[PDB]
Amino acid sequence: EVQLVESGGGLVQPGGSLRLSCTASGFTFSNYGFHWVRQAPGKGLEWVTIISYDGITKHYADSVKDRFTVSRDNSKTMVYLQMNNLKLDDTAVYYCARDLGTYDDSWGQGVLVTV
Amino acid sequence: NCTFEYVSFKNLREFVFKNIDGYFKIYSKHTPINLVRDLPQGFSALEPLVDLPIGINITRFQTLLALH
Amino acid sequence: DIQMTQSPSALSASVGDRVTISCRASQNIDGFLAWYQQKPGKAPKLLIYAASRLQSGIPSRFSGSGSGTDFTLTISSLQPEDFAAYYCQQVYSAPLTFGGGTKVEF
Amino acid sequence: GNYNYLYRLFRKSNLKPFERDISTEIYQAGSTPCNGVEGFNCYFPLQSYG
């Protein structure tokens, strides 16, 4: 089974720095690429960023571009979504999903982020 | 990890081992011998029991002998 | 980038009633769409990956249809578990956009 | 890219028909021995298909 858990989400002041953690267990974390998604209340989902399996190559959404950074550690089997210059609009429940859009896709339970 | 599983001197059993196009062929015949010291001279033809598509090249073989 | 919206409004069909949602891409994403099912307070579950082929661990009733821009999902019979907000994401581009969503209610 | 698919970029000899090579040993293209580690003129045999 593939298990994904999220942590590091809490109420933050506007303009604060908040960093999330994407737990990985039951699969080879290093082999698979990882994506980050957020769900705003009473809205559709919004993909935030993507990191490659090695972590060398990363892309970001237009809204969070130059504000949100994504990092990962292969040894720790965790993907970190650093968030900076946070706004009231940014408030969402952040879901970390691995291999989005494919058979391999799995979805984490998520941790609420409030600003 | 086993591709094939099989659930089922006075004896001589003869085997021909060959690997061709990733297929291993075993020809098995079962003929009783009379002389204990060595097989008496005779002519036999071995009929293939089964063909296995192992694909692995074989460069060496070894035997297994039960010890009391 | 590509933008994903769901055309149908919230449908309050009862249990055992067939329902069909439509997802439309802004520009051609070929067969790169992923249908999801998110229960409130729950992780989204990917119903169908790409088109036609159902995802493993998803009930047979859910179906994947639609080529090119147009994509469609049909549920043969409704159930209490089925009611949720469904969302579709383009996978063709490097940035990913998610569907607006359609609420399913009893 | 899909790391799920890899092709054998470098092999010492051409494979015979219906023969499978799954070996991951480092390819000694260079005269110098690879020694089981990455080095100049030494490349991993499998090149992940992009």
UniProtKB/Swiss-Prot annotation, chain B:
Highest rank taxon of the organism: Viruses
Effect caused by changing I33V: In strain: Omicron/BA.2.75
Positions glycosylated per UniProt: N1, N57
Result when mutating A45V: In strain: 20A.EU1
Purpose of the protein: Attaches the virion to the cell membrane by interacting with host receptor, initiating the infection. The major receptor is host ACE2. When S2/S2' has been cleaved, binding to the receptor triggers direct fusion at the cell membrane. When S2/S2' has not been cleaved, binding to the receptor results in internalization of the virus by endocytosis using host TFRC and GRM2 and leading to fusion of the virion membrane with the host endosomal membrane. Alternatively, may use NRP1/NRP2 and integrin as entry receptors.
Quaternary structure (record): Binds to host ACE2. RBD also interacts with the N-linked glycan on 'Asn-90' of ACE2. Cleavage of S generates a polybasic C-terminal sequence on S1 that binds to host Neuropilin-1 (NRP1) and Neuropilin-2 (NRP2) receptors. Interacts with host integrin alpha-5/beta-1 (ITGA5:ITGB1) and with ACE2 in complex with integrin alpha-5/beta-1 (ITGA5:ITGB1). May interact via cytoplasmic c-terminus with M protein. May interact (via N-terminus) with host bilirubin and biliverdin, thereby preventing antibody binding to the SARS-CoV-2 spike NTD via an allosteric mechanism.
Protein's name in the database: Spike protein S1
Gene: S
Residues of the full protein shown: 165 to 245 of 1273
Swiss-Prot record, chain D:
Region (Disordered): 9-44
Spans annotated as Immunodominant HLA epitope recognized by the CD8+: 2-10
Phenotype for E38D: Increased replication in human TMEM106B overexpressing cells
Cystine residue pairs: C34-C42
Impact when changing F10L: In strain: Omicron/EG.5.1
Subunit comment: Binds to host ACE2. RBD also interacts with the N-linked glycan on 'Asn-90' of ACE2. Cleavage of S generates a polybasic C-terminal sequence on S1 that binds to host Neuropilin-1 (NRP1) and Neuropilin-2 (NRP2) receptors. Interacts with host integrin alpha-5/beta-1 (ITGA5:ITGB1) and with ACE2 in complex with integrin alpha-5/beta-1 (ITGA5:ITGB1). May interact via cytoplasmic c-terminus with M protein. May interact (via N-terminus) with host bilirubin and biliverdin, thereby preventing antibody binding to the SARS-CoV-2 spike NTD via an allosteric mechanism.
Known function: Attaches the virion to the cell membrane by interacting with host receptor, initiating the infection. The major receptor is host ACE2. When S2/S2' has been cleaved, binding to the receptor triggers direct fusion at the cell membrane. When S2/S2' has not been cleaved, binding to the receptor results in internalization of the virus by endocytosis using host TFRC and GRM2 and leading to fusion of the virion membrane with the host endosomal membrane. Alternatively, may use NRP1/NRP2 and integrin as entry receptors.
Listed name of the protein: Spike protein S1
Source organism: Severe acute respiratory syndrome coronavirus 2
Gene encoding the protein: S
Whole-protein coverage range: 447 to 496 of 1273
